[PDB]
């Protein structure tokens, strides 16, 4: 199916306590593969998936060089943004940046993105055409004017359409057993009495990959969206994901209820019933 590569960067200032903390992480789809943490001992980009450990020293040296340069640009940025917004030197602030690319089923370029936030709010974001920027205020319009200039525009375009796509495909190939897999959810249902007149039915999806899934309850074929407790999809920690959906059912009505599961690993969506 479709795939993406994304890098996520977080920089947090801590005034009086020296240098801003900087964290970088890289994902292919829902699988983390690299990290850097400025507070760690190594000062290196480090592998976080077995399939990227195969990359040689030139890869690790070059990624380490670049991620430290990223780190430095963010350190500068925190100061610039404090200047832009007339903020005091004493408060802690956060910048976040995400960039990357999507490919479709044919592994051809679909979309490129580059987005930036200050203190949890949209600051500037690259539009889908890859030339124009959405600036969220006046300060961001100042940045927009810097990032709009001829040479800088082409360079980001050459990364997002070219390099990001090439490297995504290389990773997909090199990490095939992990990245090109589809793990169908293992599903079951539990029933617990909450009183003598009501019970909870909970529909479980476990051990699935990728994270995208739909779990829904119906009563007599009617969606119970407003009465379903649906938890956020959550990592099991072994590279797979979990989700559940629960309904409270009056006693005797269990057979009216159906749980419906859609996932790319399932050739047909599943319908499950307590019976």
């Amino acid at each position: 199916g479709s795939h993406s590569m994304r890098y996520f960067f977080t920089s947090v200032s801590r005034p009086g306590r020296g240098e801003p903390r900087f964290i970088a992480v890289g994902y292919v789809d829902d699988t983390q593969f690299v990290r850097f943490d400025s507070d760690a001992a190594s000062q290196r980009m480090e592998p976080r998936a077995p399939w990227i450990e195969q990359e040689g020293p030139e890869y690790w040296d070059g990624e380490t060089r670049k991620v430290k340069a990223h780190s430095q640009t963010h350190r500068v940025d925190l100061g610039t943004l404090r200047g832009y917004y007339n903020q005091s030197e004493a408060g802690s602030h956060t910048v976040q940046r995400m960039y990357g690319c999507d490919v479709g089923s044919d592994w051809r370029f679909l979309r490129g993105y580059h987005q930036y936030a200050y203190d949890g709010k949209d600051y500037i974001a690259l539009k889908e055409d890859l030339r124009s920027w959405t600036a969220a205020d006046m300060a961001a319009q100042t940045t927009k004017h810097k990032w709009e200039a001829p040479h800088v525009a082409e360079q980001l375009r050459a990364y997002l359409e070219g390099t990001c796509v090439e490297w995504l495909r290389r990773y997909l190939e090199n990490g095939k057993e992990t990245l090109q897999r589809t793990d169908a959810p293992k599903t079951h249902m539990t029933h617990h009495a909450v009183s003598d007149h009501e019970a909870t039915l909970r529909c479980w999806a476990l051990s699935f990959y990728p994270a995208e899934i739909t779990l829904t309850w119906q009563r007599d074929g009617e969606d119970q969206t407003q009465d379903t407790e649906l938890v956020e999809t959550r990592p099991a920690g072994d590279g797979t994901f979990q989700k559940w959906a629960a309904v409270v059912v009056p006693s005797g009505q269990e057979q009216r209820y159906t749980c419906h599961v859609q996932h790319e690993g399932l050739p047909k969506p599943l319908t499950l019933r307590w019976e």
Partner: protein
């Protein structure tokens, strides 16, 4: 500034079976800013060997982290996750329930 409260889930990696080794997870998500304290507890006491994932964030910029540790559930041992964040007036404790 923006402050969003952590959502908290406590759960095991595998269906809990008494006497079988497993991992206990506390997944914290949807929070901002990123400073957070998260502890796993066994019968009220802080588990010393806890690891966590590398800080990442969602499309809306809000952060998420997975905290985890090896455990072997039994019938009587109680597990919980204890989270503190700027949006919380005191540490929030969520007990581990094996069917959640």
């Amino acid at each position: 500034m923006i402050q969003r409260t952590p959502k908290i889930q406590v759960y095991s990696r595998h269906p809990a079976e008494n006497g079988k080794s497993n991992f206990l997870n506390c997944y914290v998500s949807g929070f901002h800013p990123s400073d957070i304290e998260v502890d796993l507890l066994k019968n009220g006491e802080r588990i010393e060997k806890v690891e966590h994932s590398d800080l990442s964030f969602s499309k809306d910029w809000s952060f998420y982290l997975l905290y985890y540790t090896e455990f072997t559930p039994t019938e009587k041992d109680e597990y919980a996750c204890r989270v503190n964040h700027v949006t919380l007036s005191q540490p929030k404790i969520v007990k581990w329930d094996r069917d959640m």
